Nucleic acid binder design. Sequence first.
RNA 1: AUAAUAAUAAUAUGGUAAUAGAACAUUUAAUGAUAAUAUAUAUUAGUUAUUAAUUAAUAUAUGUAUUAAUUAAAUAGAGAA
RNA 2: AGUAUGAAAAUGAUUAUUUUAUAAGCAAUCAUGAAUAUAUUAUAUUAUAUUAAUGAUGUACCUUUUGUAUAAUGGGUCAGC
RNA 3: GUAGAAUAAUAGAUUUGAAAUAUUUAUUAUAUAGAUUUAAAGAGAUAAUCAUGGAGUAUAAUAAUUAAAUUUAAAUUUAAUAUAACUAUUAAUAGAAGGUUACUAAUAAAUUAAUAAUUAAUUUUAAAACCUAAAGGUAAACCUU
Lengths: 50, 38, 326, 112, 223
Amino acid sequence: FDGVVGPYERVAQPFIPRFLKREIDNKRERHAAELQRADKLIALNRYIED
Amino acid sequence: PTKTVPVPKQFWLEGQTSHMITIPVSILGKDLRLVATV
Amino acid sequence: LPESELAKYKEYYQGLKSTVNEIPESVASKSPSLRTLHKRLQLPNELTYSTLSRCLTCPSAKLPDKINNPTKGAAFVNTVPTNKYLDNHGLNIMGKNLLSYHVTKSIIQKYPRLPTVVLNAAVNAYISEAVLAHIAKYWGIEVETTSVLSRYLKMEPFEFTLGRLKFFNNSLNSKDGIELITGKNFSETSALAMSVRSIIAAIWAVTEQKDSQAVYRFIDDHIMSRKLDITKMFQFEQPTRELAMLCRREGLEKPVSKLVAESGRLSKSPVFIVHVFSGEETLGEGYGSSLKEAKARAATDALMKWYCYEPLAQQEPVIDPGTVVV
Amino acid sequence: AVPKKKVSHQKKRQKLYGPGKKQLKMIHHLNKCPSCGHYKRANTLCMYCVGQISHIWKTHTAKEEIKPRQEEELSELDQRVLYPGRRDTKYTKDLKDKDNYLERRVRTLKKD
Amino acid sequence: ITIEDKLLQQHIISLQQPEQLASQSLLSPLKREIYEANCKINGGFYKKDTIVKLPNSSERYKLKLTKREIEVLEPSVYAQSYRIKSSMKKATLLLRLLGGLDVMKAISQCHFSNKKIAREVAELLQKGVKDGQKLGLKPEDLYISQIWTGSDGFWRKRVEFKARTRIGIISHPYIHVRCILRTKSVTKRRLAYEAHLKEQKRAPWVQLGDKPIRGVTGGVYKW
RNA sequence: AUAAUAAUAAUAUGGUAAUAGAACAUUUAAUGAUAAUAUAUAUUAGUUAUUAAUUAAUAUAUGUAUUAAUUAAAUAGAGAA
RNA sequence: AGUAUGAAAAUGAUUAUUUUAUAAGCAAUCAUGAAUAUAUUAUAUUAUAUUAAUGAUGUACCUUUUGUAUAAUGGGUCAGC
RNA sequence: GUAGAAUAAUAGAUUUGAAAUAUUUAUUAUAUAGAUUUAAAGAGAUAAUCAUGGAGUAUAAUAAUUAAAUUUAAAUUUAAUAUAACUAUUAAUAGAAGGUUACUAAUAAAUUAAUAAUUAAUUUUAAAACCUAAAGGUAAACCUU
Ligand SMILES: [Mg+2]
Ligand SMILES: [Mg+2]
Ligand SMILES: [Mg+2]
Ligand SMILES: [Mg+2]
Ligand SMILES: [Mg+2]
Ligand SMILES: [Mg+2]
Ligand SMILES: [Mg+2]
Ligand SMILES: [Mg+2]
Ligand SMILES: [Mg+2]
Ligand SMILES: [Mg+2]
Ligand SMILES: [Mg+2]
Ligand SMILES: [Zn+2]
């Protein structure tokens, strides 16, 4: 089918170890979560500083 | 449910510019109900 | 809505704040951590537990605008605004002063004629911030690394909070390797140091009249007991000249380096032993792989001898004519 | 006749990659082609230029495709009637897809 | 009707991954920015302890990365061959030659190497170069940081009948070549710097060096 | 008049064939709280006189143990055919 | 010869740390420099981990035997049984 | 954001002591004597990366219905059930097509009960090539009557 369907080469990747990508991404996610939580906490504090 | 899938020129409709087209997927009757706003 | 949880939490927070403002004695007594600390360091009983609590409380008046950027690195959700009249800020200064005096004095006693720079270095080693922090850690002064909300949820009393160290610590400060650089006020080490200083200050306050030297004794037991090899502190430019100058200043014949023993000349690794004589009195032995090196070493040795002289307690306080200048 | 023991990983490695003889050298000997500044092996004609020349020769010295005299004016319908196109066998098909099993000469990089 | 379509390409990208670089993909925005700043400060590469300031605001940071993370971040391109019909050993015979070579040099070498696997290797290298070009990096900066052979999947064992009743089992191996190309601008420079640092650290050879008196004392002076 | 732990004094503690006594791992059945801040498995570093288990960090599951423990049983432990 | 999943090992290539081109033997153990890595109490004159400087000690394992480094038996390695 | 104080670094100005253990303090050449040392083509160990391989682990129509449990009225889990496993026991009931290749080898009702279509039970009814020891042969799916 002129390659319009089926396997599409690979994209121009950089090298990232498989078991390191898992780690780093997870860490990032955790950090994000923490940030959200931190924000919430700050908001709460603001509310009860009167 | 309408999935967007890349289709050959063989199965092209008169208009499709890109190979990319949206087409309907089938649904089980168990997952859809009758209307009549009901 | 049978339960107004926000209200209860608010109340709890208020209570905590009140306690902090007061540092009630009863509450302090109830705290286990504080008690343990008191026992550990064998503090005088005149020192109350309220005082101890105060010592662990660093000045945190108003929450910064750096909080509002948790997206930008920092978030301060652990601390609760302190009372301005009941912080460790005053005590801390006093403690610092004490450390500066006493340690320095001790050093002087140990080693008259200690070049001023070297003395300063020694003092720093004895009571630098880092060292103080380490000491605090050893003692067991832990930091309040738990949000107020979290504490409330846990349902822990205020006693525990009192027991912990309290300052504006950045919750989420080294996460994902990002560290928000801030002033001295928000560092843990600094806080620890302050706490240590505050304890000393407190001790001084309690034992200013009944036993004045008690504080000093305590310091000696804790701060001055620590090993520091003063020999490792020196570094000379061209010592020979300095030595000569010293000799000139004193009533000594001009110093001359002379070969005492020599082996393995014409080799990868020779050994030359040179003494620096002043007439007959040998002023510094010096070994070396080269002659020059040996000479240098001798000079250095002589300088060390001159400086690190440690007189006895039975002697009459010796006062040096400062440092040699050339 | 026969190995007394399984040859250890070390030993085999050192037999194989150890000596110089067994290693591939780097082809230092290569230089610019005078006609188009591409890389070519030293003391050797550039494979592109020569190929091009050959092609041109072929184009010029092309033999006349001897087309039959009859089939040129042979009606399309008539042709169809005569010579109907059969289905080729698997083998024939395979043979026909030359691209699958046949290699075209690669072009070098430009020397600098 | 002409097409190869942008939408299609986008879809393909979505299916696999974005073309973006590792430094961009792995790190969280702020962190990424910080990293970039650090790199700018220290000429291309990350440095162990450098208090950096963002261009926009007046806040300052100190970035702390583990070795592995650092290694990953420095811009790379990863290229993979298809199922080459050759044996690992044969491949590695060539691949040992292309160790730390500049990609172009390696390609040139491949071109003139009279080994069948060489063609495919060259092709792979070309592909890698193309990818690099697409994603940020310039051909003349790319070197082969490391390149290796794996066995590919399902080798088919055949019986090979010998004289008398004897039976060999022939196996037809298929492999794949993978390479990682990094950049002489950043990664190589960084490693050079590291080397220099190490050298600086190195204690000098002293003739009468204080070599420790090895052994136990015994609770008794021998001097 | 027992058990558990700790002392003091003493005597004893190599071991093939073999006899005797006591434990642990694994899996199944009976009873059985609990919980994604939990669990299971894995890697690394610790801890307990340590074929075992536990702690911390990390990775992958999984809305979660035939889980702790006591019994009952075994296709119950492998460098040796 | 179900489907998912799969950092189980043996096995291959590659990179890093380290040791190695005057050295001779179950490849370990004990001693013992040096180099590197990690560590939010390395306060250090720190602690662990990795590593064939160097020294000493050290005839694989099973089976069967009066007795085995034996040049007596058995095993290419790993996984499952 | 501005101003003032404490300390640190850098630069300048003004003083400063000194023939400074310069026949080596800092550092550069060459010579003559000695003395040593520094490899990595490849390798070992450890780790990691990319493989190979498929042990281990999970799961067994994942629907529908039933009951319970948990959250907001729907979902999730638990246990049971299928036309869709075998094995052992116990209890009940009963004593039954394969192949081959083609001119492919099909169905039609009625009555009774349940509620015109209906499902069930009880029934009658059409088709159904060739071969599978004994119309009679043969080399099964062919031939001969
Ligand atoms: Mg596979
Ligand atoms: Mg033959
Ligand atoms: Mg073979
Ligand atoms: Mg015994
Ligand atoms: Mg068994
Ligand atoms: Mg086994
Ligand atoms: Mg065993
Ligand atoms: Mg023997
Ligand atoms: Mg054998
Ligand atoms: Mg080396
Ligand atoms: Mg016949
Ligand atoms: Zn040319």
